[PDB]
């Protein structure tokens, strides 16, 4: 209905994460940023942004392209939850930093859903602002076994913020 859950993906795991979140929270629409516009973004007041990290801290390409047509005023009057995917073992110094590029614009808004850096093993990530990850962080390469627990707790954490 009215929560817009925007994903971008090369592997498909971000779409499957978006759908899991959508089933959990309810009243959402799941939309591929590859097929979406500034117009579409602004047809929601509340959003969850699901973006995997590509290479050493870049944003997945579709997300990069889409974010490029949005400016910070497109976020300021919205509630925003971010969901990053990353691989803490391979990219310990740039872990799930994909979402940070989204955060550089989205932090104008009401960003909700920050999570504890606890339970992840890594040295650095710009995804971390003021002691917390800016969003939910999933690592399907190394902690695929924690992904459902994580989504469940995160939805309980933000569900009230989404209305
Ligand atoms: Cl993905």
Curated annotation (Swiss-Prot):
Report the superkingdom from the record. Bacteria
What keyword terms does UniProt attach to this protein? Electron transport, Flavoprotein, FMN, Transport
Residue ranges annotated as coiled coil are none
User: What cofactor is this protein dependent on?
Assistant: FMN
Q: Which PROSITE patterns match?
A: FLAVODOXIN_LIKE
NCBIfam families, sorted:
flav_long, PRK09267.1-5
In Swiss-Prot or TrEMBL terms, this protein is called: Flavodoxin
User: Which organism's genome codes for this protein?
Assistant: Helicobacter pylori (strain ATCC 700392 / 26695) (Campylobacter pylori)
């Amino acid at each position: 209905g009215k929560i817009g859950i925007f994903f971008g993906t090369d592997s498909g795991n971000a779409e499957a994460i978006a759908e899991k979140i959508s089933k959990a929270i309810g009243n959402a629409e799941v939309v591929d940023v590859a097929k979406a516009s500034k117009e579409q973004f602004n047809s929601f007041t509340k959003v969850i942004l699901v973006a995997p990290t590509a290479g050493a801290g870049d944003l997945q390409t579709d997300w990069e392209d889409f974010l490029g047509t949005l400016e910070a005023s497109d976020f300021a009057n919205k509630t925003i939850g971010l969901v990053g995917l990353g691989d803490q073992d391979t990219y310990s110094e740039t872990f799930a930093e994909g979402i940070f590029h989204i955060y550089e614009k989205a932090k104008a808004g009401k960003v909700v859903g920050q999570t504890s850096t606890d339970g992840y093993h890594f040295e650095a990530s710009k995804a971390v602002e003021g002691g917390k990850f800016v969003g939910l962080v999933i690592d399907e390469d190394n902690q695929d076994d924690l992904t459902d627990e994580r989504i469940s707790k995160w939805v309980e954490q933000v569900k009230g913020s989404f209305a």
